Design a protein around this ligand. Structure first.
Ligand SMILES: [Cu+2]
Ligand SMILES: [Cu+2]
Ligand SMILES: [Cu+2]
Ligand SMILES: [Cu+2]
Lengths: 125, 125, 125, 125
């Protein structure tokens, strides 16, 4: 029922070699797993997020976001990343994101708690 | 079972007058609703996210994040915000965040798609 | 000649206890020194930046930004911070900023090169 | 005298078609002009910034940053962008950046004052 439900659902890969597996729900839900090719991470982590299930029909992308807390049965990196971005459909479909990775810190170290970057996800590679 | 499950669960208010209502699950899940006092928003929006359910015990905060897609039964702002931050417990408990708000745009306008800011949430006011 | 040339010029202090000393030029130039209370820093560092020397007169703030490269005669932290923000005049004058702190890294570590945060500067404390 | 003084100095182009012309000083100064291919901008704007004039020699990039206030003789967009990033030398030399673009706003609208993005600059195209 969601406009890009079919387009978003599936496996995505970013420029670092990380793998994102997501199911988009009719209502706007995103659920899946994330596996990072870098950092203090191993195997799959739970992700959850939201997307605009009724986007503009004027060539605009579809806004979405999701979160991974970097705790699973193997490791705990005491941190969470949120990706905020848009899905762009078509022959070379893309999810273009910026992200914020916050670590748990003392109050004294909170100024250096948050990394920022950008990931581009594609259906191939 | 989550260390700050009790501490995170409940109603939070930020510096803009927005209201965040969240339930923290034992496993790391965050579920709830968000009501923004500003922007192209009215009433409650679904949120989902994740938190570190077993944080460090050295005075460090608890990493977490969540997403709101700004579509509900009243409005659709074709955008999504992700908050990335940490929960700090105690007498004046806080969730200190930075956020990324991405709008759906054409490819030509993608350079101006994403706002960034910071929200501090407290249990009062 | 710049509208907030007088208002911006002088000594500013942020929430971390850092000290910013700046001279605003008529043309839009910012020149001065920065001393950080935190991180891999000691004593004063050169800063340079720019501000809007003819801002809107509708209660709006004055856009500005500046850069510090964290090399001086004492230390080199192989990094640079840029602050982007606005000056708000009046009895409790403020410079409200967000910043990006990029470290020199290998290409493999570039994903974790950039910290993000927010500093508020006041004329007192 | 600066390690990458020669490498940084010159004309750079980003993915939007914008042109950055910079001179790197021996001491760490960056001076030049910026011409944006997008947004509320026309012709050249003054930029100033800083770079690490003695970077690490372990394959690491060179940290740098600069600011443009979007006022010149043609237009005033009541805003300033800061780019924070690193210069990576070699056959395909790059300046990889993230940026913050703050507009002058009322206090009520300050939450939506700041855009964030990322630009990659190359010596060709
Ligand atoms: Cu619409
Ligand atoms: Cu631990
Ligand atoms: Cu004007
Ligand atoms: Cu060194």
């Amino acid at each position: 029922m969601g406009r890009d439900e079919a387009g978003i659902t599936g496996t995505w890969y970013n420029q670092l070699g990380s793998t994102f597996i997501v199911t988009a729900g009719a209502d706007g839900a995103l659920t899946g797993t994330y596996e990072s090719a870098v950092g203090n991470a191993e195997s799959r982590y739970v992700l959850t997020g939201r997307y605009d299930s009724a986007p503009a029909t004027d060539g605009s992308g579809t806004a979405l976001g999701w979160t991974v807390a970097w705790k699973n049965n193997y490791r705990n990196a005491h941190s969470a990343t949120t990706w905020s971005g848009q899905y762009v459909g078509g022959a070379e479909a893309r999810i273009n994101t910026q992200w914020l990775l916050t670590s748990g810190t003392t109050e004294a170290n909170a100024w250096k708690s948050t990394l920022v970057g950008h990931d581009t996800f594609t259906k191939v590679k």
